[PDB]
Amino acid sequence: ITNLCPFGEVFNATRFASVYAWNRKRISNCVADYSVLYNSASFSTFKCYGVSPTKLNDLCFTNVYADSFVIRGDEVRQIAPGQTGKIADYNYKLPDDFTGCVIAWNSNNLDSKVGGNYNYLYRLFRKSNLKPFERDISTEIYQAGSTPCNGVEGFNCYFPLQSYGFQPTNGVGYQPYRVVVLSFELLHAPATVCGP
């Protein structure tokens, strides 16, 4: 008879995470109906290197890590094995030789409306270039000189985060494109998420 784990509620909703405080939902012990995302779908740019989209339902990995992101139109391509840009260098990073799928669908509506939204800020100005799979839920004034400012901003001492100033009247390569990354795992553990 089977069932279906709440995969879609991660995919559809009004308020999606952020660029740096990105949600990462673990999904296990379910029959995730992958047929709904490729066989009958209206999602642009469903290129999800790592496993062939066909017969995805007949191969199953250990645990699901569902992600969620909001990116400008042009900056969607930064999801790649490292590459360049302000994603995967200070934002969430894609590990090298990673195996999992990536989807990016336009969201000009459904909570992307007039006015630079209060949330949806960058994650910028980190002293290091991050490590894969680690999550940045911390905020503090950056270091950009000899003396460390003691908590009061001024010369240098940049605040890391700046808001996305988008709206439903923007261009073509700058409108929001909500991004979902389904991360598999390859390890010595049995596969949990399985089923037709």
Epitope: L124, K127, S128, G145, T147, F155, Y158, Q162
Partner: antibody, heavy 122, light 109 residues
Framework: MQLVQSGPEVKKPGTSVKVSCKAS????????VQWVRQARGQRLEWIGW????????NYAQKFQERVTITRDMSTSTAYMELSSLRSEDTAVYYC????????????????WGQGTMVTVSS | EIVLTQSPGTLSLSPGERATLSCRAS???????LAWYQQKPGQAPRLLIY???SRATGFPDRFSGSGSGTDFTLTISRLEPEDFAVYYC?????????FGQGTKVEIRR
């Protein structure tokens, strides 16, 4: 380590103006840029700073109005429009930037330019 | 915020100087958010001491001075006639980042 500026612009008494500082030789992705005023045989007045890694700016008491910066991330440049040009603005505007490369960088504003020459005459 | 008015005006003597200049302040500013530029006739300025606690990367030697908050003093000790031009103090930290009056130098004749 070079920074070239546009040629001497000529305007009319109160239309507009825009100046360009091309930044080269240092990482312009994460740095800061400032703009000043000068004259002949006169003092220097700070105008407006640009955190250029991510745009956030303020202005001096006489420059809150009639002035706003322009980012233009690509081509590694910087712009600011001055509006309602006044006669006593025959100034060399200059620009400065810290030598930043890698995420942490020098405090003193060490990378400068040469400036333009604007004369709001007939 | 702007009462700096560097005490010296125009001073004139050949090399053989122990001269010093002062950058008085309105309120004692935190050090290392300071600067001391050096304008030149018909060119762009430079940077000499970046915060009264060091010296800049590379510049001619034989002078480096530091002071307190309301008195960010500085000194010059027998520099060559090449370095005879208008100086300009500076402040960081609090907007507006204000500069100073500037100090002028001269030579006995």
């Amino acid at each position: 380590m070079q920074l070239v500026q546009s040629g001497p612009e000529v305007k009319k008494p109160g239309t507009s103006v825009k100046v360009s500082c091309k930044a080269s030789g240092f990482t312009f992705t994460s740095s800061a840029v400032q703009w000043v005023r000068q004259a002949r045989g006169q003092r220097l007045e700070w105008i407006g700073w640009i955190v250029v890694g991510s745009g956030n700016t303020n202005y001096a008491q006489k420059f809150q109005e009639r002035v706003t910066i322009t980012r233009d991330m690509s081509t590694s440049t910087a712009y600011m429009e001055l509006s309602s040009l006044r006669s006593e603005d025959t100034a060399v505007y200059y620009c400065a930037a810290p030598y930043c490369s890698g995420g942490s960088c020098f405090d003193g504003f060490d990378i400068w330019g040469q400036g333009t020459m604007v004369t709001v005459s007939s | 915020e702007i009462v700096l008015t560097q005490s010296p005006g125009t001073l004139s003597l050949s090399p053989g100087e122990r001269a010093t200049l002062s950058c008085r302040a309105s309120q004692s500013v935190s050090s290392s958010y300071l600067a001391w530029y050096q304008q030149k006739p018909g060119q762009a300025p430079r940077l000499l001491i970046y915060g009264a606690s060091s010296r800049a990367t590379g510049f001619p030697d034989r002078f480096s001075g530091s002071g307190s908050g309301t008195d960010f003093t500085l000194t010059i000790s027998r520099l060559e006639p090449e370095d005879f031009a208008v100086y300009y103090c500076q402040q960081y930290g609090n907007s507006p980042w204000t500069f100073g009056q500037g100090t002028k130098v001269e030579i006995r004749r």
